[PDB]
């Protein structure tokens, strides 16, 4: 997702009091609204409970190296929460896929949709379920009756763009409390007046 020619606040996206986890590096969480960037990229996907640990700048594994590589200069925020009551069902929910095998490393912020059968040896298989080859794509094991470490969690990534360009998005002055019956200075669109 790309957000351009819009303006919004991140305070609503934090006071939900329902997110199980929250990770944002590069910028302090309480001082990101007033700082202004150009574009915001939203990368939304699903992942298990034992793989949210590997989604961090500078970690290895089987998902953070084969599906989405996090660079060292990663300044985005990761917001994840549990919604197992909608994306899982009895009898086996196998609608979600993930990659297990890859030939080599992949560049960060790059998507791979190759369905070619990964070759482990030197003998071709001609795309069959034979010997010395296996399919890289494997189905998940989601179940609504799981514990706390294997449920489908929704993981999103909100990165920022920093280039020689204007800010499509910005943090405008918030709605300050409308204090009353006190000598307070205000500026309501035409004048900087002080009074009750």
């Amino acid at each position, epitope marked *: 997702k*790309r957000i351009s020619n819009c303006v919004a606040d991140y305070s609503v996206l934090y006071n939900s009091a329902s997110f199980s986890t929250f990770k944002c590096y590069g910028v302090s969480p309480t001082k990101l609204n007033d700082l202004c960037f150009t574009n915001v990229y939203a990368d939304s996907f699903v992942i298990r409970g034992d793989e949210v640990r590997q989604i961090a700048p500078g970690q290895t594994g089987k998902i953070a190296d084969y599906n989405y590589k996090l660079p060292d200069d990663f300044t985005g925020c990761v917001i994840a929460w549990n919604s197992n009551n909608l994306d899982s069902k009895v009898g086996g929910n196998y*609608n979600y*896929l993930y990659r297990l095998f890859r030939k080599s490393n992949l560049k960060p912020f*790059e998507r791979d*949709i*190759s*369905t*070619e059968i990964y070759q482990a040896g030197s003998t071709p298989c001609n*795309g069959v379920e034979g010997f010395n080859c296996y399919f890289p794509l494997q189905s998940y094991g989601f179940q609504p009756t799981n514990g706390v470490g294997y449920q489908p969690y929704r993981v999103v990534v909100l990165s920022f763009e920093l280039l020689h360009a204007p800010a499509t998005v910005c943090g405008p002055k918030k709605s300050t409390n409308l204090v009353k019956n006190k000598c307070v200075n205000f500026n309501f669109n035409g004048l900087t007046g002080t009074g009750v």
Partner: antibody, heavy 123, light 111 residues
Framework: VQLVESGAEVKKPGSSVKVSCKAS????????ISWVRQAPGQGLEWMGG????????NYAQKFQGRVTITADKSTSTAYMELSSLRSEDTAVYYC?????????????????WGRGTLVTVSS | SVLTQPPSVSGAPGQRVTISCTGS?????????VHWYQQLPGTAPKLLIY???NRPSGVPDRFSGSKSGTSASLAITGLQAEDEADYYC???????????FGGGTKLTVLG
């Protein structure tokens, strides 16, 4: 390879239509198989794609749970079953194929296409 | 739907004919690639160019594909005796959670 569909077929408004996609040769058990429909008078829309090696159904949000796709790997033939035919289903389906690659874009492309099943329903 | 294409364009047999495809910032503006297909009235459409960087086998080099940021363009050189078909834009849409085709441009004037 060479993928061959059936010919014209006329059903009833409220019946079930069953068509099949036939693959000659190989390279059918290693790539995802989708269906593309072209309608005279509007654009083309994509119902969903089925991966045949593992058997996961991946449809689109614009289509509800009415049409189901089943694939058999014993004879390399995929079957399409659609029910509750309406008046705006007079179009032609196609048997497409997905060939993934690596890059920044990573967009699904249909390099291989079928012939076309002329499915028209009316009174 | 989310993709809009001109109804028809005019050209001459010997000059450059170009097309413009404008969509949204979530399907083509995000960074996905385009795939251009030719819809001949009477035969199955085939693949012309994928990713706007590689040339598939059996496709002439006269077709050129470029992505000028949000909008994607296709340019041809010379009008032969087989351009009486339709051109479509195909790109992955995140909002639609799938592939969506464009409107379609008819390439004919008289005769």
């Amino acid at each position: 390879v060479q993928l061959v569909e059936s010919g014209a077929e006329v059903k009833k408004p409220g019946s079930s239509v069953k068509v099949s996609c036939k693959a000659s040769g190989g390279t059918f058990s290693s790539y995802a198989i989708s269906w593309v429909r072209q309608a005279p008078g509007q654009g083309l829309e994509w119902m969903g794609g089925i991966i045949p090696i593992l058997g996961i159904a991946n449809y689109a949000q614009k289509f509800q749970g009415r049409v189901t796709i089943t694939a058999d790997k014993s004879t390399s033939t995929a079957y399409m079953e659609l029910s509750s035919l309406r008046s705006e289903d007079t179009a032609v389906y196609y048997c497409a194929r997905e060939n993934g690659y690596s890059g920044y874009g990573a967009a699904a492309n249909f390099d291989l296409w079928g012939r076309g099943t002329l499915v028209t329903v009316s009174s | 739907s989310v993709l809009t294409q001109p109804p028809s364009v005019s050209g001459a047999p010997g000059q450059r004919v170009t097309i413009s495809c404008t969509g949204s910032s979530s399907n083509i503006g995000a960074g996905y690639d385009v795939h251009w297909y030719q819809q001949l009235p009477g035969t199955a459409p085939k693949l012309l160019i994928y990713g706007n960087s590689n040339r598939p086998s059996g496709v002439p080099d006269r077709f050129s594909g470029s992505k000028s940021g949000t909008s994607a363009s296709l340019a041809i050189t010379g009008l032969q005796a087989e351009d009486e078909a339709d051109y479509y834009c195909q790109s992955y849409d995140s909002s639609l959670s799938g592939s969506v085709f464009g409107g379609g441009t008819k390439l004919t004037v008289l005769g």
